[PDB]
Write a protein that binds this ligand. Structure first.
Ligand SMILES: Brc1ccsc1-c1cc[nH]n1
Length: 209
């Protein structure tokens, strides 16, 4: 059973700007997603200090980057705190409204798209390179869900029946046809070294078979 939701108008506006604006420096999407993973890992690490059983769903705190050329996907996996259904439908978009307005105003004042993370809406930079984004996520207090959007104003949420994740979030970038450079080992390595070199969790770049 699949539920379909409309983005808030401000967030749809932001996604169209990201998809339609000419902007060559697309590689910053990966810094933003890794940063979000790092923040989620920080949150479960902090919570586990007062309730160690929150790590019963998995003690390892890490980030994996998995390219797949056959499916044309780049997947960013983390074992962070994960997202509830309420986060996916309501909470994250509510938080994002204010950051979106501020970001769109800054852009009109001369900021550029690479500053998106300073406004808390860096996830949407995924649409610089992805035609579709799938997010599989599992919080300790909720079931495993799959969120998906190809933009256009709507997203879906369903319970996920795939492989159980334990805890954390998998962001699956279905890359645009002309963005397959982000499946290349040498390119991902270059980007992580330039933008993400001091992230405090192990980042493993998987190689393709
Ligand atoms: Br946003 C967000 C909110 C709770 S978890 C999470 C996340 C985890 C990986 N990326 N984003």
């Amino acid at each position: 059973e699949v539920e379909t939701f409309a983005f808030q108008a401000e967030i749809a506006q932001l996604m169209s700007l990201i998809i339609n604006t000419f902007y060559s420096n697309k590689e910053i999407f990966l810094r933003e997603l890794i940063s979000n993973s790092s923040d989620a890992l920080d949150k479960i690490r902090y919570e586990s200090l007062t309730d160690p059983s929150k790590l019963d769903s998995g003690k390892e705190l890490h980030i994996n980057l998995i390219p797949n050329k056959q499916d044309r996907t780049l997947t960013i996996v983390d074992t962070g705190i994960g997202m509830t259904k309420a986060d996916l439908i309501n909470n994250l978009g509510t938080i994002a409204k204010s950051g979106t307005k501020a970001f769109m105003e800054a852009l009109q004042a001369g900021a550029d798209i690479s500053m998106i993370g300073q406004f808390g809406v860096g996830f949407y930079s995924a649409y610089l390179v992805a035609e579709k984004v799938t997010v599989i996520t599992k919080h300790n207090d909720d079931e495993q869900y799959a969120w998906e959007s190809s933009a256009g104003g709507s997203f879906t949420v369903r319970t996920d029946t795939g492989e159980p994740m334990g805890r954390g979030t998998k962001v699956i970038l279905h890359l645009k046809e002309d963005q397959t450079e982000y499946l290349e080992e040498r390119r991902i390595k270059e980007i992580v070294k330039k933008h993400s070199q001091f992230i405090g969790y192990p980042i493993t770049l998987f190689v393709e078979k």
